[PDB]
Amino acid sequence: KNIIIGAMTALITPFKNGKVDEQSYARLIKRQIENGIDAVVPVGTTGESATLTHEEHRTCIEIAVETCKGTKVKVLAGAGSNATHEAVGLAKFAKEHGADGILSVAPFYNKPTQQGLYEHYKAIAQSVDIPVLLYNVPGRTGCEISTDTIIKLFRDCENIYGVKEASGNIDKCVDLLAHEPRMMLISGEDAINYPILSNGGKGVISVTSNLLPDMISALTHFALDENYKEAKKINDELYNINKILFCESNPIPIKTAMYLAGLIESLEFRLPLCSPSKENFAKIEEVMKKYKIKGF
């Protein structure tokens, strides 16, 4: 199976005057590349998938592919949708435009059954020939991809190679890899990056890495080499910032931190996302003071 693993970043999508800031997007990706990141994920939850048009979604995938050209960094393109025909379209676009693989979030809002999730992902996987990583985040979607469904998809579809888990459920991570040790379990939850990796997870798709790519990168590669002492020390050091980046709904805190660090020009979200409370703004600024934030 071909895979996309290692330290990976869920890219924020910067806006300027309501539009996608395209030179800022490329500069941010370059910064990720230069700080040891193995793959970038354009337009997932952290990239405000919901409020981008299908056109802008495709533009961000193109900038990501073009920027990683001539490097080892891969593009795991965000391509999920709660409509199977929409998810297949994004997957086909990502393949035709040079993505190395796709991330595909479980359908949100309409809550398909396990049978429906299976058929949803099989249709996506059969539409292209690049790796497909499932993405389970039940707190945001309202549905869960069960362990049985994940394992069935991995065994039944050649290009489905694993899952990004954002479920706060280390029991499920044991279940997954105890019954199907060939799959690539990816941490979707920065605070518990090390425990997932120490159980045989093979990478992370990180929010914190937007701000501290070098630290998340070192953590992941220490862990992959079974240097657990070093990996845990970094995971422990990162806990405070990992938690404060979800004081409000992601990506409101991470965009706030990137702006405070001078890495993006203006805060700016697209509604219904908005700027944090003054309290949380001050809390994010405080926690940031304890870390070294690389510039450009």
Ligand X SMILES: N[C@@H](CCCC[NH3+])C(=O)O
For binding to its own copies (CB under 8 A), which residues are involved?
45, 48-51, 82-85, 107-113, 115-117, 119-120, 123, 139-142, 248-249, 252, 270-274, 276-277
151 known member of a binding site: no
Residue 113: count other Cβ atoms within 10 Å of its Cβ.
10
Please indicate whether residue 259 is annotated as part of the active site: no
The partner in contact with residue 30, picked from ligand X, its own copies, none with C-beta cut-offs of 5 to 8 angstroms by kind, is none
**Is residue 104 at the binding interface for ligand X, with CB under 6 A as the rule?**
no
**Is residue 58 at the binding interface for ligand X, with CB under 6 A as the rule?**
no
Which of 8, 11, 37, 52 is in the footprint of ligand X by CB under 6 A? 52
Tokens of 294: 């690389």
113 known member of a binding site: no
The partner in contact with residue 210, picked from ligand X, its own copies, none with C-beta cut-offs of 5 to 8 angstroms by kind, is none
Please indicate whether residue 164 is annotated as part of the active site: yes
Q: Which is nearer to its own copies, 270 or 294 (CB)?
A: 270
Which of 35, 45, 67, 82 is in the footprint of ligand X by CB under 6 A? 82
Q: Which is nearer to its own copies, 140 or 294 (CB)?
A: 140
| Shortest distance (Å) from residue 139 CB to ligand X | 16
Q: Can you tell me which residue has the tokens 């409020």? A: 51
**Is residue 54 at the binding interface for ligand X, with CB under 6 A as the rule?**
yes
**Is residue 116 at the binding interface for ligand X, with CB under 6 A as the rule?**
no
**Is residue 46 at the binding interface for ligand X, with CB under 6 A as the rule?**
no
Which of 2, 71, 83, 182 is in the footprint of ligand X by CB under 6 A? 83
Of the residues 118, 121, 135, 194, only one is catalytic, namely 135
**Is residue 11 at the binding interface for ligand X, with CB under 6 A as the rule?**
no
Q: Where are the alpha helices (DSSP H) in the chain?
A: 22-33, 54-67, 84-96, 114-127, 138-141, 147-156, 170-179, 193-198, 213-224, 228-237, 239-244, 252-260, 278-288
Alpha-carbon gap, residue 114 to 9, rounded angstroms: 28
Tokens of 86: 């929409």
Alpha-carbon gap, residue 212 to 32, rounded angstroms: 9
Tokens of 102: 């796709």
Which of 57, 152, 164, 172 is in the footprint of ligand X by CB under 6 A? 57
Within 8 A by CB and 6+ apart from 32, the residues are: 9, 11, 40, 73, 209, 210, 213
Which of 27, 34, 59, 86 is in the footprint of ligand X by CB under 6 A? 86
Of the residues 164, 172, 232, 255, only one is catalytic, namely 164
CB 44 within 8 A of CB 103: yes
Alpha-carbon gap, residue 35 to 264, rounded angstroms: 17
**Is residue 45 at the binding interface for ligand X, with CB under 6 A as the rule?**
no
Alpha-carbon gap, residue 164 to 162, rounded angstroms: 7
| Shortest distance (Å) from residue 53 CB to ligand X | 6
Where does the chain break, by residue before each gap (C–N > 2.5 Å)?
none
| N- to C-terminal Cα separation, the chain | 35
Single-letter amino acid, residue 54: H
| Shortest distance (Å) from residue 103 CB to ligand X | 12
Q: Which residues are catalytic?
A: 135, 164
Residue positions in the annotated binding site for pyruvate?
Answer: 46, 205
Write out the residues near ligand X by the rule CB under 6 A: 49-50, 52, 54, 57, 81-83, 86, 109
